Amino acid sequence: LPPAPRYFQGENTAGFMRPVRFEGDITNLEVVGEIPKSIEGTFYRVMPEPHLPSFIPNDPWFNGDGNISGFYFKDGHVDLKQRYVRTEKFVREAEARRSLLGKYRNRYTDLVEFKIRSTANTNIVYWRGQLLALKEDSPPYAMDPETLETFGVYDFDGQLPSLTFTAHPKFDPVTREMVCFGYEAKGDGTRDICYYSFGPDGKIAETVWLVSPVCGMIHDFAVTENFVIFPIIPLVCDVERMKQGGDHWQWDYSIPMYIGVLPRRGAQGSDVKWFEAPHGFAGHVANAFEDDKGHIQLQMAYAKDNVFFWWPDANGKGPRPGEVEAHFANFVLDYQSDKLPLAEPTYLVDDDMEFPRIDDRVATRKHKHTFFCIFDRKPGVTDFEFVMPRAGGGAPMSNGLAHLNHETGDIQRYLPGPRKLTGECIFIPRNSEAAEGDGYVMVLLANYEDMCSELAVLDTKDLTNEVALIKLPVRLRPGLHGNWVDKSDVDGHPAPL
Amino acid sequence: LPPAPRYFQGENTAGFMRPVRFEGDITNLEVVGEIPKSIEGTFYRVMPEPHLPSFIPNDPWFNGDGNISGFYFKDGHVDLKQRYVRTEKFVREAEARRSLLGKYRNRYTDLVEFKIRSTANTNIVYWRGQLLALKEDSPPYAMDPETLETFGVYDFDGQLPSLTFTAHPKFDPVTREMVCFGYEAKGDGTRDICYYSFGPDGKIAETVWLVSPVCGMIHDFAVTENFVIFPIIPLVCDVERMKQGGDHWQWDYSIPMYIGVLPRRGAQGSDVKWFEAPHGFAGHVANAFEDDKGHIQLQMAYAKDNVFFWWPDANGKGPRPGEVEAHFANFVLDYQSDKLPLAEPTYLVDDDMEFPRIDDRVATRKHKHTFFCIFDRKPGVTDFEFVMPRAGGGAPMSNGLAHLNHETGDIQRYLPGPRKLTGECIFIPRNSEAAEGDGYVMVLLANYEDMCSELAVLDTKDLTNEVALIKLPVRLRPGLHGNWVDKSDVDGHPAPL
Ligand SMILES: [Cl-]
Ligand SMILES: [Cl-]
Ligand SMILES: [Fe+2]
Ligand SMILES: [Fe+2]
């Protein structure tokens, strides 16, 4: 077997990216300022965090074992519980005390045969009294929201029709449905998309098999009252490349950014229309809705080049680190149209942005508030000379949050400071009566001065001001997605506006 | 109630002294070099680590909640398990989410009435399949060696005769007895010492009540084949001072360092002889033994002034921080003598030293190896300019270990480096055949460059060289005592030489 390193090496595990790999509890976190005493619930987030040094040099950030953080808030007090998802990979590597899973989404490089290759490291959502730890190459792993115990790989009472479950399911606040899909839904390199939904009682509702024009990465999707929308990142899979030890994903400069539209209910696979947006990178969906004329307004991060630059084209052509900006785009789609090519999108702000969140009380409907990460290169905002030598590599950088009011066009920007960066934020309704986008925003900060993490609590009345700064004495490595589960929501999801 | 602060303030909780307060697991610790594959067992250490900010300003380091670290070694792999002792204080404060216990050893300052005031934060020893978490004002807390679960306050099957159990019991390697005492054994300010022992079957053997000439701190003691020896630190307790909110302990410049000698077996309290050593501070006992003439050779750290300078005399007179040195002293005692005053001791090395360990296979008998902490002010050994601003306050500093061979007089010094400090070391016999003092030394390092802890593994054949450096990604706050439990020892203690 290729030897197992006994300590982490390489930029992807240097400085703030160095794995900590702790599981357990820190109760009564230190607080500067005051956590509003009416906040009650849990902020769950997932980070990739390799449990053992990889035998793959410069293993991408997306290949690290999913470690779940819960921040449990009550009466202005907050406790941290932290635990790794017990994936097949985690358990067998813990047993062997060495890495066994090889390259990102390439089973031909594994040192043993895995049934499930999930790192469960992308998103952590609440569904019918369980957490679901998501990774788009796999079914979910079900976990206990209170103890973070892993129950096991989850197949929805044997109803899961797909080998894959997206990291970005949508929760319809009116129907209480979880709207899902998986791509490569029949295995490596398949063009099968399985679109499926679950009613609030846990019974499968929709199941539609459709076919992607290419085997492309469908990381996120969008749901409106009557449609589901599949934006394809022009990263393309060739299993023959994988069998020779090559990358699962390879950029294709020659294809459009496909945007598939399928009727939400009662459709067959052949009903999908593959619209062709100008070539670019499909970033995260803020939200989509039908306007009065029944046109789909799809609002999402959109870049003009390969954000995942470590997977370039067949000739190694691609951007450098920190070169590609993504912009908050509005695409207009008409399912009735037979024109496949789409206009350039309009842009809602100028900021280099990503990780958009809305008030999920209006998910699939007209939203007028978006909270998102921004990366501002304007001199002074980030002390790059101090931060970059401490930052390591492999993870995106965000040096603020912005709140866009879509009606007034007003933008508020939160800047944690010149030696801090942010993760993805969550939005918390002030209470069950609160107006759209009124309440609290929380975001995890990397503090490069202390080499510690902090959890910032902001009031939407003034995003520029920290109401509380929760001071962790450890690092939480830069992570991916997270969700708020309010104690007042019995099913874990907020009530429709 | 006096308000509970929501974050740590004061020098005692700044820099490397900032509480982390994590409980749980970090498995498969990063290793630079190679842990000898034949090492099998667990290094247990305890640190004071306040779980909640004190309402007492500049609460001394000795008043922090005991947090137990276990380093579990097998086949060159090591895992950390970390858990707080569930003392009455820990449990009630966790319930209230605020500090309730007041000043060090002063119940008159507590915000509620405690039955047991233990922080269980001084030593962690193995006895008949349990850990005992020790604090000299209390009975032990019994814990599970594998899970670090707290069973509860331990009374040895109802046999414990004393309110108090020393942090420094001695394990007789020939008789397999645990030799114990407690001072203030009948409550605050009592001069009662209870000397007691347990046979390897768990049955109490000795129980002798005697009387201290003053109510003085008896932190450590010594055991030989035929004697037990009680060195009294000239810190003296007045309950009337405590009732007004004053300190439990106050230096008395006017008394000798009393050294009581009692026959080990069959004695009455009146059989104690209170020898009078020159005024000074009784530091930790390395070991004591009888020579051929049956005279006690007592080897211990000894200073000429108050090491615990934060508890000065009645007029606030005493040393400044970093002023008092302790030296490795040999006192000679003859139980037969009626001369109470004792000569100045001889000194075995010149180093400012403390935390002496021997090969416990010769405990209570002639030893010829001692391992100890040194503090060397020789320019360059510690980069004080870098370390002091990052160190916080309240804890002693050690910038190396020394191995003294008592036969050859050879000293080897381990220097972890200019920006690292050490805790108390443990000694591990190479195997059950190994000569006295032959095997491995482990010591926890504070790395002020990384603000991380490391666990150094040294071979006694060359103490200057790290065979392995285990790299923790978190801080373990400076702690007190620790012990090795070898997997090859059925009762957790090594076999006699
Ligand atoms: Cl589990
Ligand atoms: Cl417990
Ligand atoms: Fe994502
Ligand atoms: Fe001690």
PDB file of N, CA and C in Angstrom, chain A residues 425-471:
ATOM      1  N   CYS A 425     -23.467  32.434   5.884  1.00  0.00           N
ATOM      2  CA  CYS A 425     -24.307  32.946   6.988  1.00  0.00           C
ATOM      3  C   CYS A 425     -25.592  32.115   7.047  1.00  0.00           C
ATOM      4  N   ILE A 426     -26.294  32.220   8.170  1.00  0.00           N
ATOM      5  CA  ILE A 426     -27.709  31.782   8.316  1.00  0.00           C
ATOM      6  C   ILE A 426     -28.535  33.020   8.668  1.00  0.00           C
ATOM      7  N   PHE A 427     -29.809  32.961   8.303  1.00  0.00           N
ATOM      8  CA  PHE A 427     -30.836  33.947   8.691  1.00  0.00           C
ATOM      9  C   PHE A 427     -31.819  33.302   9.673  1.00  0.00           C
ATOM     10  N   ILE A 428     -32.149  34.043  10.724  1.00  0.00           N
ATOM     11  CA  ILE A 428     -33.089  33.633  11.813  1.00  0.00           C
ATOM     12  C   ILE A 428     -34.204  34.673  11.885  1.00  0.00           C
ATOM     13  N   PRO A 429     -35.470  34.320  11.570  1.00  0.00           N
ATOM     14  CA  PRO A 429     -36.588  35.244  11.781  1.00  0.00           C
ATOM     15  C   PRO A 429     -36.589  35.764  13.224  1.00  0.00           C
ATOM     16  N   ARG A 430     -36.814  37.066  13.423  1.00  0.00           N
ATOM     17  CA  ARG A 430     -36.834  37.671  14.786  1.00  0.00           C
ATOM     18  C   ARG A 430     -37.805  36.882  15.679  1.00  0.00           C
ATOM     19  N   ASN A 431     -38.933  36.449  15.121  1.00  0.00           N
ATOM     20  CA  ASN A 431     -40.002  35.666  15.795  1.00  0.00           C
ATOM     21  C   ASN A 431     -40.959  35.227  14.691  1.00  0.00           C
ATOM     22  N   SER A 432     -41.994  34.452  15.003  1.00  0.00           N
ATOM     23  CA  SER A 432     -42.899  33.877  13.975  1.00  0.00           C
ATOM     24  C   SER A 432     -43.770  34.963  13.316  1.00  0.00           C
ATOM     25  N   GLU A 433     -43.781  36.199  13.826  1.00  0.00           N
ATOM     26  CA  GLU A 433     -44.565  37.335  13.260  1.00  0.00           C
ATOM     27  C   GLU A 433     -43.683  38.223  12.382  1.00  0.00           C
ATOM     28  N   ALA A 434     -42.367  38.024  12.381  1.00  0.00           N
ATOM     29  CA  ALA A 434     -41.400  38.971  11.777  1.00  0.00           C
ATOM     30  C   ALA A 434     -41.628  39.063  10.261  1.00  0.00           C
ATOM     31  N   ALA A 435     -41.463  40.266   9.728  1.00  0.00           N
ATOM     32  CA  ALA A 435     -41.443  40.566   8.281  1.00  0.00           C
ATOM     33  C   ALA A 435     -40.303  39.785   7.610  1.00  0.00           C
ATOM     34  N   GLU A 436     -40.439  39.534   6.310  1.00  0.00           N
ATOM     35  CA  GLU A 436     -39.384  38.887   5.500  1.00  0.00           C
ATOM     36  C   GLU A 436     -38.047  39.566   5.806  1.00  0.00           C
ATOM     37  N   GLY A 437     -37.011  38.777   6.094  1.00  0.00           N
ATOM     38  CA  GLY A 437     -35.631  39.288   6.196  1.00  0.00           C
ATOM     39  C   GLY A 437     -35.388  40.095   7.456  1.00  0.00           C
ATOM     40  N   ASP A 438     -36.335  40.076   8.397  1.00  0.00           N
ATOM     41  CA  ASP A 438     -36.197  40.786   9.693  1.00  0.00           C
ATOM     42  C   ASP A 438     -35.826  39.779  10.785  1.00  0.00           C
ATOM     43  N   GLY A 439     -34.675  39.984  11.409  1.00  0.00           N
ATOM     44  CA  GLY A 439     -34.222  39.134  12.518  1.00  0.00           C
ATOM     45  C   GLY A 439     -32.721  39.191  12.659  1.00  0.00           C
ATOM     46  N   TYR A 440     -32.091  38.021  12.751  1.00  0.00           N
ATOM     47  CA  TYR A 440     -30.656  37.897  13.081  1.00  0.00           C
ATOM     48  C   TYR A 440     -29.945  37.148  11.951  1.00  0.00           C
ATOM     49  N   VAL A 441     -28.685  37.504  11.753  1.00  0.00           N
ATOM     50  CA  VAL A 441     -27.760  36.763  10.860  1.00  0.00           C
ATOM     51  C   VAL A 441     -26.610  36.262  11.727  1.00  0.00           C
ATOM     52  N   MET A 442     -26.232  34.997  11.556  1.00  0.00           N
ATOM     53  CA  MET A 442     -25.036  34.451  12.225  1.00  0.00           C
ATOM     54  C   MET A 442     -24.057  33.996  11.153  1.00  0.00           C
ATOM     55  N   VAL A 443     -22.781  34.131  11.450  1.00  0.00           N
ATOM     56  CA  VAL A 443     -21.716  33.741  10.493  1.00  0.00           C
ATOM     57  C   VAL A 443     -20.478  33.399  11.309  1.00  0.00           C
ATOM     58  N   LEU A 444     -19.822  32.325  10.912  1.00  0.00           N
ATOM     59  CA  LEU A 444     -18.572  31.866  11.541  1.00  0.00           C
ATOM     60  C   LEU A 444     -17.417  32.654  10.926  1.00  0.00           C
ATOM     61  N   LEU A 445     -16.544  33.198  11.773  1.00  0.00           N
ATOM     62  CA  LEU A 445     -15.372  33.994  11.357  1.00  0.00           C
ATOM     63  C   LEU A 445     -14.131  33.164  11.613  1.00  0.00           C
ATOM     64  N   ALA A 446     -13.184  33.241  10.685  1.00  0.00           N
ATOM     65  CA  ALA A 446     -11.792  32.801  10.892  1.00  0.00           C
ATOM     66  C   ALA A 446     -11.013  34.048  11.295  1.00  0.00           C
ATOM     67  N   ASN A 447     -10.472  34.044  12.503  1.00  0.00           N
ATOM     68  CA  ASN A 447      -9.679  35.156  13.063  1.00  0.00           C
ATOM     69  C   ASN A 447      -8.206  34.773  12.935  1.00  0.00           C
ATOM     70  N   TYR A 448      -7.514  35.325  11.936  1.00  0.00           N
ATOM     71  CA  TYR A 448      -6.125  34.938  11.591  1.00  0.00           C
ATOM     72  C   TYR A 448      -5.158  35.539  12.624  1.00  0.00           C
ATOM     73  N   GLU A 449      -5.574  36.553  13.393  1.00  0.00           N
ATOM     74  CA  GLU A 449      -4.732  37.121  14.485  1.00  0.00           C
ATOM     75  C   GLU A 449      -4.643  36.128  15.635  1.00  0.00           C
ATOM     76  N   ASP A 450      -5.774  35.558  16.053  1.00  0.00           N
ATOM     77  CA  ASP A 450      -5.856  34.637  17.216  1.00  0.00           C
ATOM     78  C   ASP A 450      -5.636  33.203  16.736  1.00  0.00           C
ATOM     79  N   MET A 451      -5.755  32.953  15.428  1.00  0.00           N
ATOM     80  CA  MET A 451      -5.897  31.582  14.862  1.00  0.00           C
ATOM     81  C   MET A 451      -6.990  30.854  15.661  1.00  0.00           C
ATOM     82  N   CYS A 452      -8.116  31.533  15.855  1.00  0.00           N
ATOM     83  CA  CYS A 452      -9.334  31.004  16.509  1.00  0.00           C
ATOM     84  C   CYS A 452     -10.522  31.315  15.609  1.00  0.00           C
ATOM     85  N   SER A 453     -11.615  30.608  15.820  1.00  0.00           N
ATOM     86  CA  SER A 453     -12.909  30.875  15.166  1.00  0.00           C
ATOM     87  C   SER A 453     -13.771  31.701  16.127  1.00  0.00           C
ATOM     88  N   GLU A 454     -14.701  32.452  15.569  1.00  0.00           N
ATOM     89  CA  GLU A 454     -15.681  33.265  16.316  1.00  0.00           C
ATOM     90  C   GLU A 454     -17.009  33.086  15.604  1.00  0.00           C
ATOM     91  N   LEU A 455     -18.111  33.140  16.340  1.00  0.00           N
ATOM     92  CA  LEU A 455     -19.459  33.134  15.753  1.00  0.00           C
ATOM     93  C   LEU A 455     -20.072  34.517  16.002  1.00  0.00           C
ATOM     94  N   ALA A 456     -20.258  35.279  14.923  1.00  0.00           N
ATOM     95  CA  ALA A 456     -20.832  36.637  14.958  1.00  0.00           C
ATOM     96  C   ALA A 456     -22.357  36.534  14.909  1.00  0.00           C
ATOM     97  N   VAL A 457     -23.021  37.325  15.746  1.00  0.00           N
ATOM     98  CA  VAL A 457     -24.494  37.508  15.708  1.00  0.00           C
ATOM     99  C   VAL A 457     -24.772  38.961  15.339  1.00  0.00           C
ATOM    100  N   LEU A 458     -25.508  39.156  14.246  1.00  0.00           N
ATOM    101  CA  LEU A 458     -25.869  40.482  13.687  1.00  0.00           C
ATOM    102  C   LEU A 458     -27.383  40.625  13.735  1.00  0.00           C
ATOM    103  N   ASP A 459     -27.864  41.858  13.922  1.00  0.00           N
ATOM    104  CA  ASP A 459     -29.302  42.210  13.771  1.00  0.00           C
ATOM    105  C   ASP A 459     -29.481  42.806  12.369  1.00  0.00           C
ATOM    106  N   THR A 460     -30.479  42.343  11.615  1.00  0.00           N
ATOM    107  CA  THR A 460     -30.776  42.827  10.236  1.00  0.00           C
ATOM    108  C   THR A 460     -31.106  44.331  10.225  1.00  0.00           C
ATOM    109  N   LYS A 461     -31.488  44.936  11.350  1.00  0.00           N
ATOM    110  CA  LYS A 461     -31.734  46.407  11.441  1.00  0.00           C
ATOM    111  C   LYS A 461     -30.432  47.164  11.192  1.00  0.00           C
ATOM    112  N   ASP A 462     -29.272  46.559  11.452  1.00  0.00           N
ATOM    113  CA  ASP A 462     -27.936  47.153  11.160  1.00  0.00           C
ATOM    114  C   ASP A 462     -26.889  46.039  11.036  1.00  0.00           C
ATOM    115  N   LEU A 463     -26.690  45.536   9.818  1.00  0.00           N
ATOM    116  CA  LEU A 463     -25.782  44.397   9.558  1.00  0.00           C
ATOM    117  C   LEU A 463     -24.334  44.786   9.878  1.00  0.00           C
ATOM    118  N   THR A 464     -24.006  46.080   9.978  1.00  0.00           N
ATOM    119  CA  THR A 464     -22.601  46.549  10.144  1.00  0.00           C
ATOM    120  C   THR A 464     -22.118  46.276  11.566  1.00  0.00           C
ATOM    121  N   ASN A 465     -23.032  46.047  12.511  1.00  0.00           N
ATOM    122  CA  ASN A 465     -22.715  45.991  13.965  1.00  0.00           C
ATOM    123  C   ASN A 465     -22.903  44.554  14.486  1.00  0.00           C
ATOM    124  N   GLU A 466     -21.885  44.017  15.154  1.00  0.00           N
ATOM    125  CA  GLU A 466     -21.983  42.751  15.924  1.00  0.00           C
ATOM    126  C   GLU A 466     -22.778  43.024  17.208  1.00  0.00           C
ATOM    127  N   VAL A 467     -23.903  42.347  17.382  1.00  0.00           N
ATOM    128  CA  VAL A 467     -24.651  42.347  18.674  1.00  0.00           C
ATOM    129  C   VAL A 467     -23.913  41.434  19.659  1.00  0.00           C
ATOM    130  N   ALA A 468     -23.325  40.345  19.171  1.00  0.00           N
ATOM    131  CA  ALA A 468     -22.535  39.421  20.015  1.00  0.00           C
ATOM    132  C   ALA A 468     -21.418  38.813  19.171  1.00  0.00           C
ATOM    133  N   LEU A 469     -20.288  38.556  19.802  1.00  0.00           N
ATOM    134  CA  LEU A 469     -19.162  37.835  19.185  1.00  0.00           C
ATOM    135  C   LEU A 469     -18.830  36.684  20.123  1.00  0.00           C
ATOM    136  N   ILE A 470     -19.124  35.464  19.684  1.00  0.00           N
ATOM    137  CA  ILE A 470     -18.900  34.220  20.467  1.00  0.00           C
ATOM    138  C   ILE A 470     -17.479  33.750  20.146  1.00  0.00           C
ATOM    139  N   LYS A 471     -16.628  33.641  21.159  1.00  0.00           N
ATOM    140  CA  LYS A 471     -15.168  33.466  20.979  1.00  0.00           C
ATOM    141  C   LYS A 471     -14.810  32.006  21.246  1.00  0.00           C
TER     142      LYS A 471
END
